[PDB]
Write a protein that binds this ligand. Structure first.
Ligand code: R8V
Lengths: 300, 237
């Protein structure tokens, strides 16, 4: 169980750690988070009390180094930094645990939510979507645009999600226009799965990462990507049965965790009604359909 | 963007454009079966592809064999329309290809856009206008060539006859839409107006009677009256 220690908390901020959040007051004795479960990626994220705009945060994996958080008064944000020195880091953390100046990652033993939301998400794939090779952790915020969004402006601050476009030559074989448009299985299985993602776990990992960035940062391009990757599976008549069962589980836990007061902007009415009631897979998402009907019958 | 009355003169500028109407592509009669159920029987249709600046009509005849053994024909018809429009564009020399294709029905947008991916510089546009091109099959010579076709066939016409020798495209398109609107709203009366005098002839290479300028004024007034009468009848006004 690892630790993301903070050097201090100079500005009042709401701090998220995965699906949990804590309020920290200005200059409150706050020295970070302990007992972070090993074996999953994690995200630590921030909303300043004085700018409810720009949520931002850092994706990380404690197996990949000794990360701390230090406030930068010039750039005005809490920054993630790696502590090379395992023993500067160790004696410091040691102190802070002794003074009980760390909050405990508040996992309920029975609770598999975070695993369920991050099952296929790997740090190495995050770092390919979020290109910043000098760090082992990846920064995301509310305003970052996607590569696709940028084709329709700073390339270094982009989310390099795989571009999905249903009215594209990549999506449509010459001479199969109607076939490939109305049944996207070619695009899903040959172009995307076999060709670009290599396997369904990588596909699901990007889908899960896009959802989490939409939920935690309100990142609009991420929400677009999550919906596109759902729609591509649902609009395919031929999908491995194992992917369909896993997708239902994936979506179920995303819909379960979504904040109720965000469903209006996080859920695309057209995609969800098409996927649940019109598409080839309208009868393959039983758990997702049931939680959607009992929680957001308004959208449908 | 969508084509409407605000940008209507754009049809007669020097950017080559085509209207595509798919209303008459998939045509059926509905009848009872021996067992008392209902069945459809297809008859030949056509794609109506019209250059409104020049009058050139590319009438692609859709023979009923196209539908043999196919399911969801109303949906297939839109894709067949898109396939044939794209094939037409590919057959034209580059300097003859349209810069815009305006579809009369919004459901034609995605099929055409997909079939036209190889032509990124051709815009595909809907329209808010309620254009009466469905009534093309009330023009006798067009209906006749569609029904007599025994195989797929493209037939070329100028839907304006020789009018452009004397009037502008804008005026010719207004005259065409008036005639078509009238034929749509009351085919019998409209054809009576055009056809009441058999000594006014139609030239072998024309679709419409050879009205003098002053007879056209009379005819156009009669078509206006027809359309307004029908309008009051529909809405008890
Ligand atoms: C520079 N700093 C580090 O070396 C470090 C390590 C853990 C917690 C806090 C800090 C500190 O600020």
């Amino acid at each position: 169980m690892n630790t993301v220690p903070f050097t201090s908390a100079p500005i009042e901020v709401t701090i998220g750690i995965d699906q949990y959040s804590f309020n920290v007051k200005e200059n409150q004795p706050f020295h970070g988070i302990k007992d972070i479960p090993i074996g999953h990626v994690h995200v630590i994220h921030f909303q300043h009390a004085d700018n409810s705009s720009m949520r931002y945060g850092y994706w990380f994996d404690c197996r990949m180094g000794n990360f701390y958080i230090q406030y930068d008064p010039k750039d005005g944000l809490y920054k993630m930094m790696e502590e090379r020195d395992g023993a500067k880091f160790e004696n410091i953390v040691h102190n802070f645990k002794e003074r009980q100046m760390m909050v405990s990652y508040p996992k309920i033993d029975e609770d598999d939510t975070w695993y369920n939301l991050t099952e296929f998400v790997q740090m190495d794939k995050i770092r390919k979507i979020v290109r910043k090779d000098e760090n082992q952790f990846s920064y995301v915020d509310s305003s970052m645009t996607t590569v696709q969004e940028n084709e329709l402006s700073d390339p270094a601050h982009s989310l390099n999600y795989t571009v999905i476009n249903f009215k594209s030559r990549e999506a449509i074989r010459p001479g199969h226009e109607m076939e490939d448009f109305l049944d996207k299985s070619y695009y899903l299985n040959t172009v995307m799965l076999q060709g670009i993602f290599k396997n369904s776990s990588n596909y699901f990992g990007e889908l899960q990462f896009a959802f989490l960035n939409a939920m935690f940062f309100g990142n609009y391009g991420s929400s677009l990507q999550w919906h596109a990757m759902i729609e591509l599976i649902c609009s395919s008549a031929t999908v491995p049965k194992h992917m369909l069962d896993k997708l239902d589980e994936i979506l179920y836990y995303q819909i379960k965790t979504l904040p109720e007061q965000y469903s209006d902007i996080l859920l695309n009415e057209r995609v969800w009604n098409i996927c649940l009631y019109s598409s080839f897979q309208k009868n393959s998402l039983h758990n997702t359909e049931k939680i959607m009907e009992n929680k957001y019958p308004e959208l449908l | 963007g969508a084509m409407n009355s605000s940008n209507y003169a754009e049809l007669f500028n020097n950017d080559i454009k085509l209207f595509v109407d798919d209303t008459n592509v998939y045509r059926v009669t509905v009848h009872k079966t021996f067992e008392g159920n209902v069945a459809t029987k297809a008859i030949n249709g056509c794609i109506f592809t019209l250059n409104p600046k020049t009058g050139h009509l590319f009438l692609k005849i859709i023979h009923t064999s196209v539908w043999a053994g196919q399911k969801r024909l109303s949906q297939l018809a839109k894709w067949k329309t898109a396939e044939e429009v794209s094939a037409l564009v590919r057959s034209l020399p580059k300097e003859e290809q349209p810069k815009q294709i305006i579809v009369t029905r919004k459901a034609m947008l995605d099929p055409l856009e997909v079939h036209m991916l190889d032509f990124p510089n051709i815009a595909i546009r809907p329209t808010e206008l309620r254009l009466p091109f469905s009534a093309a099959m009330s023009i006798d010579k067009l209906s006749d060539v569609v029904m007599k076709a025994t195989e797929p066939q493209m037939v070329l016409f100028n839907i304006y006859d020789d009018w452009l020798d004397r009037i502008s495209s804008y005026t010719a398109f207004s005259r065409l839409t008036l005639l078509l609107r009238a034929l749509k709203t009351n085919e019998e009366s409209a054809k009576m107006i055009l056809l009441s005098d058999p000594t006014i002839t139609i030239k072998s290479y024309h679709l419409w009677p050879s009205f003098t300028d002053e007879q056209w004024i009379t005819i156009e007034s009669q078509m206006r009256d027809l359309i307004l009468t029908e309008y009051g009848r529909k809405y008890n006004v």
